[PDB]
Design a protein around this ligand. Structure first.
Ligand SMILES: *[C@@H]1O[C@H](CO)[C@@H](O[C@@H]2O[C@H](CO)[C@@H](O[C@@H]3O[C@H](CO)[C@@H](O)[C@H](O[C@H]4O[C@H](CO)[C@@H](O)[C@H](O)[C@@H]4O)[C@@H]3O)[C@H](O)[C@H]2NC(C)=O)[C@H](O)[C@H]1NC(C)=O
Ligand SMILES: *[C@@H]1O[C@H](CO)[C@@H](O[C@@H]2O[C@H](CO)[C@@H](O)[C@H](O)[C@H]2NC(C)=O)[C@H](O)[C@H]1NC(C)=O
Length: 604
């Protein structure tokens, strides 16, 4: 639990301190090598706790390191730290091998490009555990070490190549704007380039400093120690006068464990308690394997909830999901648009046959766009193929920049429509269907245009019948204390501030959508229960009353599924789409949960 740190020590001092700390029940959790290969310096962190046997090496040339690596590999040991300093031909190496059980690990110190590490790892997702960009600027070499990502941990590392240098301040700001995201390591090269790695695991309060002299580091370590933060990473770079340090501090030595929580009741089943045990077992296996933190399952019969199970597999700093919490619905949002158009047609305010752009007063660049009717947009047969021409729903930034205001103002729904009506169709209306986010955007504008009511107002008054279905607002700052965390590793350029260079999280504009203009297509949020209830009297797919079909949505931060099968309706919400693969999700929604509904009947 006690944390011992040293930095700016030579091989001989490292070896003395190592032998004494180890003999007094410490294990090495961080090793950095830096400086000149003829006089390398070391920074190390040691934690006083029990654990498996380990081996360390330092001042090792390539031959000695590879021989020692291969030797301890052959004895079941696993590389957990790797560092190198100097020109390729002349480099010295340091490392830690541990007697741990890791299925698959990978390491190369011969990479000339860090992106080449994927060829080493094949089809296996890894968490990078060790790194050093060594060599020289003209002849760059990389040590990269990765462990198989058991638990599907969410991580990033931003590499610098001979042809691109990471701006550390802007990367650090972008990555830590994502909720719970924190530095794991701040790797540092001899030419003072930071290669930072991030995680959304929790070590309590944390802090960091970069570009520190040993004097500044010593002060910073004392400052943080008084506050009860201890070093979890330390990295040196440079020799002599230009020696500098990165450091990350945390309250804890290791990530908090996740804890399992379930809320809600199954009420309308033959054997309610045996139904809970089985579906809990299914969801628990899925969430543990895929590292999913927050999820909901719900069954409804004729618009009435007969089952709700809300699931948390999360550290104690994530809210415990309840059945009435709301999840970003992504393209499940579309069934509310279909219901809105159904309302307008059956109240004689619109026809399936109504030509849309003539109704709006637009003169398309494509004569064929004059034939696009309400039905074409419901069916996605209107002529918009995003595989050919890209997806307008994620082009708000590029669209705003094309305006006369030249990116000073965010693009509106109307701006996207005007942009699209001035571009050709990809195909003749009605020839085939191509799944389109844009088609229900244009129909959401038609709803406002015909009624003079904002789409959200129209939904509350005439469609939702008091269901808590809400716009998921774009801005990250509106979501910083939300119970439900919409999780993505991803960041992108900001469509709300189209002249800003600063990357925003994927669920908060990073994916390229302004959610305020996408209520009709994927920007709504609701409970699984609200979904299961709604599809009881509305088409889950297509337009009209209840049908036997299903609908899903995928955005950065969200996965949702709803299905009407037989007499009942069921829904599933996840706080992520970054589960392991589609095959994990498809198995859950197409075998596991349907096979549960078969094996556990509703009340007789
Ligand atoms: C249904 O959708 C259509 C298509 O979007 C929409 O028609 C558009 O309405 C706007 C008004 O909101 C029209 O824009 C006007 O165009 C005239 C010239 O033709 C301009 O001079 C107008 O300027 C006024 O407004 C400006 C902005 O506040 C001010 O800068 C200025 O001082 C003026 O007061 C104005 O821009 C637009 O031409 C149509 N577009 C088409 C293709 O018809 C329609 O209003 C929607 N209907 C409903 C009921 O919502
Ligand atoms: C929906 O369809 C009906 C029937 O085609 C349309 O009603 C017609 O409107 C046009 C234009 O004003 C008239 O010339 C016809 O005489 C109307 N027919 C009838 C039977 O009333 C209606 O305009 C369409 N709605 C929309 C919004 O396009």
């Amino acid at each position: 639990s006690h944390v011992e740190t040293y930095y700016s020590v030579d091989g001989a001092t490292h070896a003395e301190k190592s032998k004494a700390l180890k003999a007094d029940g410490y294990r090495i959790v961080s090793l950095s090598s830096y400086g000149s290969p003829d006089s390398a310096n070391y920074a190390a962190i040691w934690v006083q706790e029990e654990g498996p046997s380990f081996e360390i090496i330092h001042d090792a040339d390539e031959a000695t390191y590879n021989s020692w690596l291969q030797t301890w590999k052959s004895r079941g040991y696993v590389s957990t730290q790797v560092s190198a300093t100097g020109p390729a031909e002349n480099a010295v190496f340091a490392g830690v091998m541990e007697n741990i059980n890791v299925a698959n690990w990978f390491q190369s110190c011969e990479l000339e490009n860090p992106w080449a590490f994927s060829n080493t790892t094949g089809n296996v997702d890894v968490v990078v555990k060790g790194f050093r960009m060594f060599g020289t600027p003209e002849e760059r070499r990389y040590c990269i070490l990765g462990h198989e990502n058991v638990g599907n941990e969410q991580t990033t590392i931003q590499y610098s190549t001979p042809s691109f240098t990471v701006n550390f301040a802007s990367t650090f700001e972008a990555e830590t704007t994502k909720r719970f995201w924190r530095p794991s390591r701040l790797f540092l090269s001899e030419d003072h380039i930071i290669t930072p790695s991030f995680a959304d695991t929790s070590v309590g309060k944390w802090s960091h400093a970069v570009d520190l002299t040993k004097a500044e580091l010593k002060e910073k370590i004392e400052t943080e120690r008084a506050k009860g933060l201890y070093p979890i990473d330390i990295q040196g770079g440079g020799s002599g006068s230009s020696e500098r340090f990165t450091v990350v501090f945390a309250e804890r030595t290791s990530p908090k464990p996740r804890q399992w929580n379930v809320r809600g009741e199954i009420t309308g089943f033959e054997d309610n308690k045996a139904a809970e045990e089985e579906v809990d077992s299914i969801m628990r296996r899925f969430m543990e394997k895929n590292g999913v933190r927050q999820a909901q399952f719900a069954v409804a019969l004729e618009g009435k909830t007969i089952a709700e199970r809300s699931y948390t597999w999360a550290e104690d700093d994530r809210a415990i999901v309840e059945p009435d919490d709301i999840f970003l619905l992504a393209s499940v949002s579309k069934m509310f648009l279909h219901a809105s158009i159904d309302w307008l047609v059956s109240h004689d305010m619109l026809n399936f046959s109504t030509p849309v752009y003539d109704l709006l007063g637009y003169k398309p660049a494509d004569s064929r766009a004059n034939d696009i009717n309400v039905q074409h947009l419901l069916d996605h047969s209107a002529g918009y193929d995003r595989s050919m021409s890209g997806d307008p729903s994620f082009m708000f930034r590029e669209i705003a920049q094309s305006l006369p205001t030249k990116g000073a103002k965010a693009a509106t729904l109307r701006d996207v429509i005007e942009y699209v009506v001035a571009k050709p169709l990809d195909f003749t209306p009605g020839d085939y269907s191509a799944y389109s986010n844009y088609c229900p955007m244009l129909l959401s504008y038609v709803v406002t245009n015909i009624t003079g009511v904002p789409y959200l107002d129209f939904l509350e008054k005439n469609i939702l019948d008091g269901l808590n279905v809400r716009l998921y607002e774009t801005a990250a700052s509106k979501h910083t204390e939300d119970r439900i965390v919409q999780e993505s590793k991803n960041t992108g350029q900001d469509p709300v501030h189209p002249q800003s260079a600063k990357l925003v999280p994927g669920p908060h504009g990073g994916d390229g959508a302004v959610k305020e203009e996408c209520a009709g297509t994927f920007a709504m949020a609701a409970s699984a229960s609200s979904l299961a209830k709604f599809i009881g009297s509305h088409a889950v797919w297509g337009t009209g009353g209840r049908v036997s079909s299903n609908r899903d949505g995928s955005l950065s931060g969200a996965r949702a599924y709803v299905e009407s099968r037989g007499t009942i309706d069921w829904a599933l919400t996840l706080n992520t789409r970054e589960y392991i693969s589609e095959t994990e999700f498809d198995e859950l929604r197409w075998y596991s949960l349907p096979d549960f509904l078969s094996a556990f009947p509703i009340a007789g």
